[PDB]
Amino acid sequence: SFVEMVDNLRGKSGQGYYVEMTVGSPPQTLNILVDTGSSNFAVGAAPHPFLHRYYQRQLSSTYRDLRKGVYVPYKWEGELGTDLVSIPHGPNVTVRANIAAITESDKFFINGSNWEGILGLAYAEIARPDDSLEPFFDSLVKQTHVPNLFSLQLCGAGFEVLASVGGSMIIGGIDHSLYTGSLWYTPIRREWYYEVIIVRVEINGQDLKMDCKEYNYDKSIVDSGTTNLRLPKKVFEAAVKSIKAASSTEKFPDGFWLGEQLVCWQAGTTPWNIFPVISLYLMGEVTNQSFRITILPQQYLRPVDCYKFAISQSSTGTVMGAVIMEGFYVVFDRARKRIGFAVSACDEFRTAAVEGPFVTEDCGYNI
Numbered sequence: 067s068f069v070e071m072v073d074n075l076r077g078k079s080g081q082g083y084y085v086e087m088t089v090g091s092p093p094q095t096l097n098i099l100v101d102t103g104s105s106n107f108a109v110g111a112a113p114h115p116f117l118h119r120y121y122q123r124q125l126s127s128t129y130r131d132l133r134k135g136v137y138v139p140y141k142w143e144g145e146l147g148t149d150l151v152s153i154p155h156g157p158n159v160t161v162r163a164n165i166a167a168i169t170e171s172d173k174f175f176i177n178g179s180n181w182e183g184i185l186g187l188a189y190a191e192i193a194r195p196d197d198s199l200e201p202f203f204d205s206l207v208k209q210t211h212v213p214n215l216f217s218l219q220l221c222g223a224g225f226e227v228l229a230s231v232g233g234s235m236i237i238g239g240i241d242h243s244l245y246t247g248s249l250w251y252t253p254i255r256r257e258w259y260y261e262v263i264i265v266r267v268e269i270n271g272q273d274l275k276m277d278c279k280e281y282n283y284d285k286s287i288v289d290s291g292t293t294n295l296r297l298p299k300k301v302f303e304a305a306v307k308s309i310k311a312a313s314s315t316e317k318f319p320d321g322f323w324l325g326e327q328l329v330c331w332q333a334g335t336t337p338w339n340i341f342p343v344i345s346l347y348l349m350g351e352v353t354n355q356s357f358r359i360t361i362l363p364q365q366y367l368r369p370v371d372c373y374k375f376a377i378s379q380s381s382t383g384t385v386m387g388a389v390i391m392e393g394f395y396v397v398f399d400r401a402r403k404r405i406g407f408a409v410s411a412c413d414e415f416r417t418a419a420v421e422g423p424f425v426t427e428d429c430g431y432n433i
């Protein structure tokens with residue numbers, strides 16, 4: 067049942083959400099980043115200064131060598147093999163999955179994140195070294211009776227060390243206790259990343275009035291493995307302009323808007339009401355319909371009372387990252403090629419919202 071998967075996610079603000087997994091026999095316990103923005107099960111498999119433990123293939127009786135390497139510059143590299151994998155607070159199953167045993171890496175692992183690997187939940191098209199390497203979830207679905215869908219409730223922190231965050235990854239279904247109101251769905255435009263289409267953007271109800279192709283230039287994706295809302299240059303600039311104006315009563319250093327520095331108010335004085343809400347309208351399942359997800363400053367200002375601006379520029383399209391997902395229960399409905407959003411169960415004047423339908427075309431940035 068899904069209840070045993072509730073709160074199966076932990077993390078530190080800004081360092082991703084991880085789920086406990088085991089690999090090999092006997093089970094080796096590891097914390098693994100839940101990442102909808104990639105498609106490899108890649109796990110630290112050799113000593114590293116940021117790793118307090120790692121996957122030891124030699125300790126595993128069930129390890130099988132694929133005698134093939136993988137090199138991922140962007141870096142990390144490893145050796146492909148398969149082994150038995152389980153998620154202790156997930157489905158009660160064990161699957162033989164591809165594992166990229168990371169033997170060397172540079173600026174991949176995060177100091178103090180408390181995770182030792184990544185669970186790439188996106189599609190084979192973007193698996194490394196190529197689409198022949200079946201992703202974990204594909205293996206899980208093919209080998210078990212787990213429904214071809216998962217959902218994420220990322221809860222963030224809320225009110226010396228980075229704030230601890232929590233959440234739930236529900237594998238194989240939708241846990242109604244994790245959300246309120248209606249689930250609205252936007253199509254997965256193509257199965258590689260979880261690519262979606264944004265058709266309109268508003269800041270405090272004010273339309274940015276851009277050609278919608280701009281919102282999806284050159285793609286828009288939903289990525290738990292990204293902290294911020296990342297926006298294409300033109301959209302980021304229009305958004306920041308609008309947010310600045312909305313919060314004009316209080317002026318901040320441009321270093322804050324650039325996501326560099328933190329703004330501080332002493333405990334409990336943060337003027338949330340000065341910052342605007344942001345509404346992303348996503349293409350509906352029905353051609354000329356859309357719906358909006360509305361996020362509060364409590365989502366896009368992330369605690370480090372000090373905060374960093376969690377909206378940042380992208381040259382690879384829109385990325386609806388953790389701070390966006392944190393307002394919502396997000397359903398990755400792979401079976402029906404669609405992604406659902408609803409208000410998550412996790413101030414007194416505003417609330418994150420999911421609302422539709424709203425009236426409209428050709429917003430996709432073809433490829």
Ligand SMILES: COc1ccc([C@]2(c3cccc(-c4cccnc4)c3)N=C(N)N(C)C2=O)cc1C
Nearest residue numbers: 080081082101103104106138140174289291292
């Ligand atoms: C197959 O190779 C992969 C796999 C995953 C990733 C990353 C990744 C890698 C390491 C750490 C994080 C990370 C850091 C902080 C917060 N939250 C995720 C993300 N996951 C995504 N979504 N992103 C955009 C990435 O950079 C990168 C590469 C190159």
